[PDB]
Design a protein around this nucleic acid. Structure first.
Ligand SMILES: [Mg+2]
Ligand SMILES: [Mg+2]
Ligand SMILES: [Mg+2]
Ligand SMILES: [Mg+2]
Ligand SMILES: [Mg+2]
Ligand SMILES: [Mg+2]
Ligand SMILES: [Mg+2]
Ligand SMILES: [Mg+2]
Ligand SMILES: [Mg+2]
Ligand SMILES: [Mg+2]
Ligand SMILES: [Mg+2]
Ligand SMILES: [Mg+2]
Ligand SMILES: [Mg+2]
Ligand SMILES: [Mg+2]
Ligand SMILES: [Mg+2]
Ligand SMILES: [Mg+2]
Ligand SMILES: [Mg+2]
Ligand SMILES: [Mg+2]
Ligand SMILES: [Mg+2]
Ligand SMILES: [Mg+2]
Ligand SMILES: [Mg+2]
Ligand SMILES: [Mg+2]
Ligand SMILES: [Mg+2]
Lengths: 175, 168, 159
RNA sequence: GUCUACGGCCAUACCACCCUGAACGCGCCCGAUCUCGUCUGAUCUCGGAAGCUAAGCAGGGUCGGGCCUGGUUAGUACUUGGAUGGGAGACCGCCUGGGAAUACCGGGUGCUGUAGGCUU
RNA sequence: ACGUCGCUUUUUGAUCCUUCGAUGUCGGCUCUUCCUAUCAUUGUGAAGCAGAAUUCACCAAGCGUUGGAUUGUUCACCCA
RNA sequence: GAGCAGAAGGGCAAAAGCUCGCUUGAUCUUGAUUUUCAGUACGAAUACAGACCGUGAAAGCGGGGCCUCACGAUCCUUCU
RNA sequence: GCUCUCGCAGACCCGAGCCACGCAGUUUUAUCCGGUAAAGCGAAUGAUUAGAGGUCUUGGGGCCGAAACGAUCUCAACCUAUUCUCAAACUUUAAAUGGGUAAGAAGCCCGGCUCGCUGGCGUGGAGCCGGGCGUGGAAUGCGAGUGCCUAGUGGGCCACUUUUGGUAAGCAGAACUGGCGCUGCGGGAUGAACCGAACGCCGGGUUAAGGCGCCCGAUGCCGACGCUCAUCAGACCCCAGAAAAGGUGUUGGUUGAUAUAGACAGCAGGACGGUGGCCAUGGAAGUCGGAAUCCGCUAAGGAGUGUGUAACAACUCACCUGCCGAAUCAACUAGCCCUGAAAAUGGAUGGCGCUGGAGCGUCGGGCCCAUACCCGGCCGUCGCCGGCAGUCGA
């Protein structure tokens, strides 16, 4: 699985009706994927591990993108995951701040790649919950729970270094 | 939940070249009439054809064309296999001479018989010379890996239409 | 390098199944083999006379000759880049009727009867088999029960 | 409901121990003149009909062993095909399809063909 | 110690890729340069470093590392 | 779990093993086929057919050894 | 070469249930075949660990039993139920991939005739003669069949995966597919085999693999998020160099513990009595050792954590308490970095160089160009056994 900006998909599937049980149970999953093709593939990957289901012996009865309910509210997300390192398998709890669940999960994938060199095929998201600020544990997240938060932008780096490429004046950093 | 019918029609594009191909993959590609890179064809989907597509999965990108895709493929790049020759479909008489005995006497009849698979899909489809599409404008992601792992091979369900818009 | 012995490598091929040694059941001697029927050459090892060669074990052929204890079978053998039809004499202990031909004959008889009956009843029926079609469009009831949420489990070191 | 003669499949039929068996039957059983075999009429062969179901045999039983068939083990192990995936390697993950075997826990414990009897 | 992980190509094997219309095959002598896995010398740290002597380790190859008996010897051994 | 001559593997229980009785199918012939294979030969083998026999009450079984090895062209000689 | 198949079509124009003999390095549907992977050893054959329970024994024996081991204590063997670990030349079970066959007109169903074979039989079997059945009895693709003459070759090598010998090898030997040989082209700086893609002579467009600081086409994006400082940094398949083990460098994570009944760290007080506990002894007093590991006063103190003495003494800890006032400690784990890390001419992420990245990981949008793909031109070959004798201005 590659990435992009992830979206959340509610995928509902079941086994094909057989002359053993006519109505099999319906199973629902939250899948964070670039598109619905990848979402269906990951759904089958997970239900094959959990239940004894297969793409051939089952069908997907629903796959729809779950829009964020409050995309204008800042919130804290706690993500429980498991990933394969080079020498073992570990469970991790991570915390992020975002406006969207899929955005926070994208943050998690970028962060796992940055800090643990973990690829998306190694990572396996198993829980995403909007947590309260009082329930947050990571200091990087907790330092933004300040009603009167205030900080400058100290060392502004010139980004239009080539417009102009040559100039008399040396750039200013303090603003 | 309403589960729609499994699609009955696929568009298959060969995405890899002709160098170093294993014999079984080579045979299935010849049976699909994809003997060149960026050659496309329509495939009526059933168990027999799907298990053939699984064999050549690393070599093809396929999916479920929509009505606009079928229209543009037939109208811009549709050629007929008339007297073993590749003849452009510039007149309805070309279709009516070869497929008139099946009730197909115009481009609309041909498009209908392809989009809705119908009873004479085999004849209409084999009458269609395999489509010679261009290279994708904008590029491919990665032709050596499957679509669901960030590549291009295999079954993309309805993104084959996005691929078709750029390949013709 | 390898020997050319007639039974080299048949240590399990001609052995008997587990707890199936001993006297050969007599229905195998009671089967009737005519000319033109299809038989699979098994090659049991209790009987050593009339035994087929190891290249014919698991192959299917057509009977062309019947003797007191054996049959002549025209069976295809592949020798490098050519397939050629060998004629082998095999005792009836090492063959049995192939059921693919039985099923096909059943289907032909069914087709002929259905065609004769369908012309009389008037309407048209489908006789050719077809490959498994794409699944139809259908509805899935939830029955007022929410689908169960599935979550991947954490890793734990079993042992 | 059963048995006898000949069987088909060849343990769901086998093995161990216990209980019941009406009527035919099958037996055990009685004897060695003939037929026929022995060291031995024990077996075999022959001629029987006083007794008996004690045994064989049939049916049933046993938190029985086995066998048969399911679940679990387990979408685990293994595996077709793919990648300029990871890793120093050893190896491992993913994509695309297929998919076991123990231990452990359940259910079952002969079906049947032809011919001929008994069973109010 | 029992174990276990490496490095080196100044040993000897293993292989047979180059060379059989030929790359002159041991040693010594002569001469230059390079390496460091440092014998000495410079600067240091450690000791079962009191001093003297010695041992271990670091930065380090700038400079030096000899005269002879026997032996074709490389090696070896002894005298100084 | 023994034995079946031998190496090993397969196979085999009122068997293919053991003991008896009778025997010489370990004989006379033509073809087809399998194995190695070039679908050549040799060797070995399988299924038949025609004789003449053996055994058994008979059904049958037997033209060597339970199966997989145990062997040999032209020319010349010798015998029938 | 030959034997065929589909058609060829309308002067222009205009189709007027059913669709070619046959074939296939493919699937499907049926039906067989197999003994590898895995698994198993409380299943057989071999190998193998440890306890347990037993009643017999040419077990040693075992203490007071010579006497009936009065007795019945121990160690063996043996048996029973279990238990650890295995097999290329073991196996109950047993895949995936794979091998065979079938999916009709040479078929199906009716009547009849022949036979010296077979025989209770008008039997059985085979052959033959008539007749009737087309919904042409899975998918997909393709035109097939057949003969003669025949060169070169008969040193191979490489790669994924499987695999044997060997410490290994750019070693030797197999299986499968592809390739190089015989092959150029884009990329890998360079390179027989790697990645992309195969090639007539050109124009335009677009891509692949790969890239876009400068060499050198293209990021001169106000690219996104983090990680990382190296006094040998790192920098892209094959691939051209590294391990175990370490780090109080930094970054994430797991688990546990202490704390406003005052943590942690510092500075500051106490750290006793039985008791110089017993046995070891030349001296061992809390501290060379062998077992013990208690009690009272307590806020608390080990009959002792370490230094020290010949032994004492004297320090010190764990243990409590004062001050101090709010979070703190520990063990793991794995990213980057560092140590481990030494060779000979001066030298190699290709070079220059690069550290708000020109490095590492995860991603976006643009953009660059191959002899590949699309459109068009031109050459030739092949196919249509294509058209034209109708020059028929009537
Ligand atoms: Mg390639
Ligand atoms: Mg463009
Ligand atoms: Mg590849
Ligand atoms: Mg024999
Ligand atoms: Mg039981
Ligand atoms: Mg898999
Ligand atoms: Mg010279
Ligand atoms: Mg020279
Ligand atoms: Mg040094
Ligand atoms: Mg005869
Ligand atoms: Mg084998
Ligand atoms: Mg194994
Ligand atoms: Mg075992
Ligand atoms: Mg080799
Ligand atoms: Mg050559
Ligand atoms: Mg070639
Ligand atoms: Mg080439
Ligand atoms: Mg190149
Ligand atoms: Mg390179
Ligand atoms: Mg161009
Ligand atoms: Mg470059
Ligand atoms: Mg440039
Ligand atoms: Mg380093």
């Amino acid at each position: 699985k590659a990435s992009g900006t992830l979206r959340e998909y509610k995928v509902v599937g079941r086994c094909l009706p057989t002359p053993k049980c006519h109505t099999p149970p319906l199973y629902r999953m939250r899948i964070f994927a670039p598109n619905h093709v990848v979402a269906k593939s990951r759904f089958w990957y997970f239900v094959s591990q959990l239940k004894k289901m297969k793409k051939s012996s089952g069908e997907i009865v629903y796959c729809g993108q779950v829009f964020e309910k409050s995309p204008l509210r800042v919130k804290n997300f706690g993500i429980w995951l498991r990933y394969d390192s080079r020498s073992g398998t570990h469970n991790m709890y991570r915390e992020y701040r975002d406006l969207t669940t899929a955005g926070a999960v994208t943050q998690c994938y970028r962060d796992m790649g940055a800090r643990h060199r973990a690829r998306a095929h190694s990572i396996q998201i198993m829980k995403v919950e909007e947590i309260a600020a009082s329930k947050c544990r990571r200091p990087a997240v907790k330092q933004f729970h300040d009603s009167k938060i205030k900080f400058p932008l100290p060392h502004r780096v010139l980004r239009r270094q080539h417009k102009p490429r040559f100039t008399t004046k040396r750039p200013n950093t303090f603003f | 939940f309403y589960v729609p019918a499994e699609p009955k029609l696929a568009f298959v594009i060969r995405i890899r070249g002709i160098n170093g191909v294993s014999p079984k993959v080579r045979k299935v590609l010849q049976l699909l009439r994809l003997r060149q890179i960026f050659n496309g064809t329509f495939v009526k989907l059933n168990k027999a054809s799907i298990n053939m597509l699984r064999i050549v999965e690393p070599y093809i990108a396929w999916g479920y064309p929509n009505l606009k895709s079928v229209n543009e493929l037939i109208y811009k790049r549709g050629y007929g296999k008339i007297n073993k020759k590749r003849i452009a479909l510039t007149d309805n008489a070309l279709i009516a001479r070869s497929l008139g005995k099946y009730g197909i006497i115009c481009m609309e009849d041909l498009i209908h018989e392809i989009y809705t698979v119908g009873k004479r899909f085999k004849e209409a489809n084999n009458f269609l010379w395999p489509f010679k599409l261009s290279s994708p404008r904008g590029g491919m992601k990665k032709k050596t890996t499957h679509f669901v792992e960030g590549g291009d091979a295999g079954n993309r369900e309805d993104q084959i239409n996005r691929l078709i818009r750029r390949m013709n | 390098t390898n020997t050319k012995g007639k039974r080299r490598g048949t240590r399990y091929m001609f052995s008997r199944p587990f707890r199936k040694h001993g006297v050969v059941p007599l229905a195998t001697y009671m089967r009737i083999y005519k000319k033109g029927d299809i038989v699979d050459i098994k090659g049991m090892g209790t009987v050593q006379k009339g035994m087929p060669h190891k290249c014919y074990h698991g192959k299917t052929g057509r009977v062309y000759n019947v003797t007191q204890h054996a049959v002549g079978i025209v069976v295809n053998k592949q020798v490098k880049g050519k397939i050629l039809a060998k004629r082998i004499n095999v005792r009836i202990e090492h063959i049995k009727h192939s059921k693919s031909r039985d099923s096909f004959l059943k289907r032909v008889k069914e087709n002929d009867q259905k065609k004769k009956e369908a012309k009389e009843k008037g309407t048209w029926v489908q006789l050719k088999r077809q490959p498994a079609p794409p699944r139809e469009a259908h509805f899935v009831r939830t029955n007022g029960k929410e689908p169960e949420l599935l979550e991947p489990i954490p890793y734990e070191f079993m042992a």
